[PDB]
Amino acid sequence: STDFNDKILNEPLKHSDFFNVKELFSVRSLFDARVHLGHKAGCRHRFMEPYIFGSRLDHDIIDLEQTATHLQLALNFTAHMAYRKGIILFISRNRQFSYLIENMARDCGEYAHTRYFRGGMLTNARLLFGPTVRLPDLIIFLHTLNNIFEPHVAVRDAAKMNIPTVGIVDTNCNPCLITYPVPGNDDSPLAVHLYCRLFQTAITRAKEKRQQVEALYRLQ
Amino acid sequence: TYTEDFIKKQIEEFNIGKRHLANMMGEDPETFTQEDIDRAIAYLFPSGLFEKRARPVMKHPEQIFPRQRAIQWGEDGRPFHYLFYTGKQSYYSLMHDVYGMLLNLEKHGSR
Amino acid sequence: AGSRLETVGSIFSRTRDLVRAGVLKEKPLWFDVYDAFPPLREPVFQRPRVRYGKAKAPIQDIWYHEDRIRAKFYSVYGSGQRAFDLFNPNFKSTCQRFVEKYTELQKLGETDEEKLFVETGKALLAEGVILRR
Amino acid sequence: NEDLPISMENPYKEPLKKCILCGKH
Amino acid sequence: VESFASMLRHSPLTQMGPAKDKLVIGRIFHIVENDLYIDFGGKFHCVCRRPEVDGEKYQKGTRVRLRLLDLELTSRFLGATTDTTVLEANAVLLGIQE
Amino acid sequence: ERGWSGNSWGGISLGPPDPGPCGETYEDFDTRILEVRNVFKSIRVLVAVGNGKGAAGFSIGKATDRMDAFRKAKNRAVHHLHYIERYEDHTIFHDISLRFKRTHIKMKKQPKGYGLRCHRAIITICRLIGIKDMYAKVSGSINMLSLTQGLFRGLSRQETHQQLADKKGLHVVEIREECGPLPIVVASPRGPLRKDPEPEDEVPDVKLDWEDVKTAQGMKRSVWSNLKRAAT
Ligand code: FES
Ligand SMILES: [Mg+2]
Numbered sequence: 001s002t003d004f005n006d007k008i009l010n011e012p013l014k015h016s017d018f019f020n021v022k023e024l025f026s027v028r029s030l031f032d033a034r035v036h037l038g039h040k041a042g043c044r045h046r047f048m049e050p051y052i053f054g055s056r057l058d059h060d061i062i063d064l065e066q067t068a069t070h071l072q073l074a075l076n077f078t079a080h081m082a083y084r085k086g087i088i089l090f091i092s093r094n095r096q097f098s099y100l101i102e103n104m105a106r107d108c109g110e111y112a113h114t115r116y117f118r119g120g121m122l123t124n125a126r127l128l129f130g131p132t133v134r135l136p137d138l139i140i141f142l143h144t145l146n147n148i149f150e151p152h153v154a155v156r157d158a159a160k161m162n163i164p165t166v167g168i169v170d171t172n173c174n175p176c177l178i179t180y181p182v183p184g185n186d187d188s189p190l191a192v193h194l195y196c197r198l199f200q201t202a203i204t205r206a207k208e209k210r211q212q213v214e215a216l217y218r219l220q
Numbered sequence: 221t222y223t224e225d226f227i228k229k230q231i232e233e234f235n236i237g238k239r240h241l242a243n244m245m246g247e248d249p250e251t252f253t254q255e256d257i258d259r260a261i262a263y264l265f266p267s268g269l270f271e272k273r274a275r276p277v278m279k280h281p282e283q284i285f286p287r288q289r290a291i292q293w294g295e296d297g298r299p300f301h302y303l304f305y306t307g308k309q310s311y312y313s314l315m316h317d318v319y320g321m322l323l324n325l326e327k328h329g330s331r
Numbered sequence: 332a333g334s335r336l337e338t339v340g341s342i343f344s345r346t347r348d349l350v351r352a353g354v355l356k357e358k359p360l361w362f363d364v365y366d367a368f369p370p371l372r373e374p375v376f377q378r379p380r381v382r383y384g385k386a387k388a389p390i391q392d393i394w395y396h397e398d399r400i401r402a403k404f405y406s407v408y409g410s411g412q413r414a415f416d417l418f419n420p421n422f423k424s425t426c427q428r429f430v431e432k433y434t435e436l437q438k439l440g441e442t443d444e445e446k447l448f449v450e451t452g453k454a455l456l457a458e459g460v461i462l463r464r
Numbered sequence: 465n466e467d468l469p470i471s472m473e474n475p476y477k478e479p480l481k482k483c484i485l486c487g488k489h
Numbered sequence: 490v491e492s493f494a495s496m497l498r499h500s501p502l503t504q505m506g507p508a509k510d511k512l513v514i515g516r517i518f519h520i521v522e523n524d525l526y527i528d529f530g531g532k533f534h535c536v537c538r539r540p541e542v543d544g545e546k547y548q549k550g551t552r553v554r555l556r557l558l559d560l561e562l563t564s565r566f567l568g569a570t571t572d573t574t575v576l577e578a579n580a581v582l583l584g585i586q587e
Numbered sequence: 588e589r590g591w592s593g594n595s596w597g598g599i600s601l602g603p604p605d606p607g608p609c610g611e612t613y614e615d616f617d618t619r620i621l622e623v624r625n626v627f628k629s630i631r632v633l634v635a636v637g638n639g640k641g642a643a644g645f646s647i648g649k650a651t652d653r654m655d656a657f658r659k660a661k662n663r664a665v666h667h668l669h670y671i672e673r674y675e676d677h678t679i680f681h682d683i684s685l686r687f688k689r690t691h692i693k694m695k696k697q698p699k700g701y702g703l704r705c706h707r708a709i710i711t712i713c714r715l716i717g718i719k720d721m722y723a724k725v726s727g728s729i730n731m732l733s734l735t736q737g738l739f740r741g742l743s744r745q746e747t748h749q750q751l752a753d754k755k756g757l758h759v760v761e762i763r764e765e766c767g768p769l770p771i772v773v774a775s776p777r778g779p780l781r782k783d784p785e786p787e788d789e790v791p792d793v794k795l796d797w798e799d800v801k802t803a804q805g806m807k808r809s810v811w812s813n814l815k816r817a818a819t
C-alpha cells in the first residue's frame with residue numbers, strides 16, 4: 001500500500017495545478033458573469049474591505065484580480081478533495097437557487113443542503129444520523145448568509161468540527177472563518193450559475209482523473 | 221426486535237408449512253395460493269370470533285413482521301442519496317421532483 | 332475527534348497540534364491538501380469592530396475624468412430618450428459618444444471646457460444625432 | 465495604468481435643497 | 490491582456506453613471522400571477538406589477554422598458570449599525586420594447 | 588488521596604476520560620476536579636483534563652447527580668482541548684500578564700528545578716498540561732472559572748522563539764549565567780536573515796509592575812513570601 005499511496009495520493013500534491021483548474025475561468029468571464037457587483041457601502045462588512053476595489057456611486061465593486069486568485073485556490077482545493085473521494089456538501093439558503101444547486105450536486109455525485117438547517121446536524125451528527133455516520137470532508141457555501149442576513153450556522157459548526165470550508169463571500173459577509181473565501185457576487189443568477197458550473201466541472205474532472213490514474217496504475 | 225436471520229427462518233417455516241397444508245388438503249402445492257391458505261385454515265380451525273384479526277391466520281412472514289432496517293450508506297461511508305444530510309432525503313427529493321415538474325409546466329370521489 | 336474551539340487558532344493549527352500531541356491517531360483527509368496548497372489567509376476568528384473617532388474605511392470612490400463631462404451632459408441635454416441596454420457588453424449611449432467626441436477634440440485641439448462642449452454638440456448634430464437641451 | 469480611478473469630488477452631486485425663501489430678505 | 494480596471498472603466502453600467510431616472514431595457518425571467526420579475530443587467534432584479542393595458546403581452550422573455558430609481562433599496566434604521574436591504578431594485582414599468 | 592483539603596472536591600482525580608463516541612481512547616489523559624458548586628438542587632462541576640504533554644482543556648458539567656456532572660464535564664473537556672506550547676517541555680516561553688474579567692494572573696518563566704509556586708488550581712492545571720517550573724500570582728477576584736479561562740487564554744496566546752525569529756527575521760540567542768558568555772541560538776528564521784540590527788533602545792518604554800521592582804530592590808518584607816513548602 002506504500003506504493004499505492006506514494007503514486008496516487010501523493011503524486012497530485014507535487015504539482016501546482018494538477019487538475020488544470022486555471023483554464024476554467026478568466027477575469028473576463030467573471031466580469032461577464034457580474035461577479036464584481038457588490039452591495040452598497042451601507043451594508044459593507046469590515047473584513048471584506050481588503051477585497052473591495054472601490055465604491056462606484058455608493059455601490060461596492062469587488063476586485064476581480066483578487067477573486068481570480070481566491071477562486072483558483074478554492075477550485076484547486078475542491079478538485080484535490082474530490083480526487084481523494086471526500087464527501088462534498090454544498091450549502092445555500094437562497095431559495096432562488098435551491099433547485100439549481102440540488103441538480104448540480106446530484107449531477108457531480110456530491111451532496112446538497114439547501115433547506116432549513118436544523119440544530120446539531122454537524123455537531124450532533126451521531127445522534128441525528130447514527131453512531132457510524134461519516135461527515136463531509138469539504139463544505140462549499142454558495143451563500144454564506146441565511147435569510148435574516150446573519151452568518152449561516154453551518155460556518156461555525158464546520159469550524160467546530162474541523163471541516164474545511166470554501167465560500168462565496170459578498171461585500172456584506174464575514175470571511176473570517178471560511179477556509180478558502182472567494183470574494184464575489186452571490187445574488188445575480190449569472191454569477192451563481194458560473195460558480196455552480198465551475199465547481200461541478202472541477203469535481204467531475206477530479207473524479208475522472210482519479211479513475212484513470214487508478215486504471216493506469218493497475219495496468220502497469 | 222426481529223433480526224434478519226429470524227425473518228429468514230420464519231420464511232422457511234412458512235414455506236414448509238405451506239407445502240404441508242397443501243398436502244393435508246390434497247391440493248397441488250405448486251399452485252396452492254394464499255386464498256387457499258386462508259380458506260383451509262378457516263376450515264381446519266373454525267373461529268366465529270367477530271374480530272377478524274383474532275381468528276386463526278397463517279400469513280407470509282413479510283406481512284406479519286414489522287421489522288424494518290434500511291442502510292443509508294455503504295462501507296466506505298458515502299451516503300447513497302444526494303440529499304442525505306438534510307435528514308429527510310425522501311421528502312425533500314419528492315419536493316424537488318414536484319418543483320421541477322412545476323418548472324417544466326411553467327415553461328410550457330377521492331381524498 | 333478534534334477540538335471544537337473554533338475561536339482559538341484555525342482548523343489547521345488545531346488539527347496539527349492535536350496530531351503532534353497524539354490525541355488524533357491519523358490526520359484528516361484534507362490535512363495534506365491544506366498543507367500543500369494553503370489559503371492566502373489563515374482562517375482565524377476575529378470579532379468585527381465598530382470604528383470611532385477619525386478612523387475611516389480605506390475604500391475609495393471610483394471616479395474618471397469623463398464623469399465630469401457625463402455630469403454636464405446629463406445636466407444640459409438630460410437623460411437620453413434612447414434606453415440603455417446593459418446586456419450588450421459594447422453598448423454605446425449618446426452620452427458615451429459625446430464623451431468620446433469630447434476627448435478626441437481635446438486631444439486634437441485646445442482645452443476650453445465650454446468651447447469643447449459646444450463644438451462637440453455641433454459635431455454630434457452634424458453626424459445626425461438629435462440632442463434636445 | 466491609465467484606466468485606474470482618480471481622486472475627485474462627486475461630479476454628480478445634486479445641488480443641496482433650498483427653502484422657498486432662501487436668498488430673500 | 491485587458492485588466493479589470495479597463496473592464497470597469499468601459500463597462501456600460503459604469504458609463505451609465507447615476508441610476509436615477511435612467512431608461513433601461515429589462516427582460517422578464519419569472520412571473521408570479523401579476524408580479525413580473527425583470528432583470529436589467531444589474532446586481533438585483535426588479536418586481537413590477539402587470540400593467541392593465543396589454544397585460545397579456547407581458548410574458549417570460551419579453552423585453553420591457555424601465556425607468557430606474559434605485560439599483561438596490563436599502564435603509565438604515567434606528568439602533569442599527571448596518572443597512573437593511575430588500576435585495577431588489579426599484580424601477581417603473583413603462584411598456585414593451587417594440 | 589485527598590484533594591486540596593480533607594473535605595474538598597478540588598484537586599481530586601476523576602480517572603481517565605471515557606472512550607468517546609468518535610472511537611478515540613483517552614487512557615493517557617488525567618482529569619482533575621477544579622470546582623463543585625450547588626445550584627439552587629443540582630450540581631455544577633468545573634473540571635480540567637490533560638495528558639501532560641501540552642494537550643489540556645476544561646469544561647463545566649451540570650446535572651442533578653454529581654457523578655453525572657463529573658462524566659459530562661470530563662467528556663466535554665476532552666473535546667475542547669487546547670494545546671499549550673512549552674519551552675523545553677518544562678516551562679513557558681516568556682512572562683505572561685493577563686486580566687480576565689476582574690481576575691489578574693501574572694506568570695513568570697523560571698529555570699529548571701524551580702517547581703510550581705502558583706495557586707493550587709494553577710498547580711493542578713500545570714500538572715495536567717505538563718508545565719513543571721513557573722511562578723504565578725493571582726490578584727483581584729479569585730474566581731475559579733475566570734482563573735481557569737484566563738490561564739488557558741494566556742497559555743494559548745504565548746509566542747514561541749521560532750515564531751519570534753520568523754516575525755523579526757533574526758536569530759533568537761539565549762544567554763545563561765551558568766553557561767558564561769556562550770551564545771546559545773535557540774531559534775533561527777526559516778526565511779532569510781535581516782541584515783540591519785534591532786534598534787538599540789536606550790530606555791525601553793515597558794510597563795513595569797511595582798511588586799516585581801519592590802522585590803528586586805529588597806523593599807518587599809512579606810512574612811508569607813518565600814515560605815518553605817512541600818514539593819509541587
Ligand atoms: S435653506 Fe437657505 S436660508 Fe433656508
Ligand atoms: Mg449578497
Ligand SMILES: [Mg+2]
Nearest residue numbers: 589592593594
Ligand atoms: Mg479532615
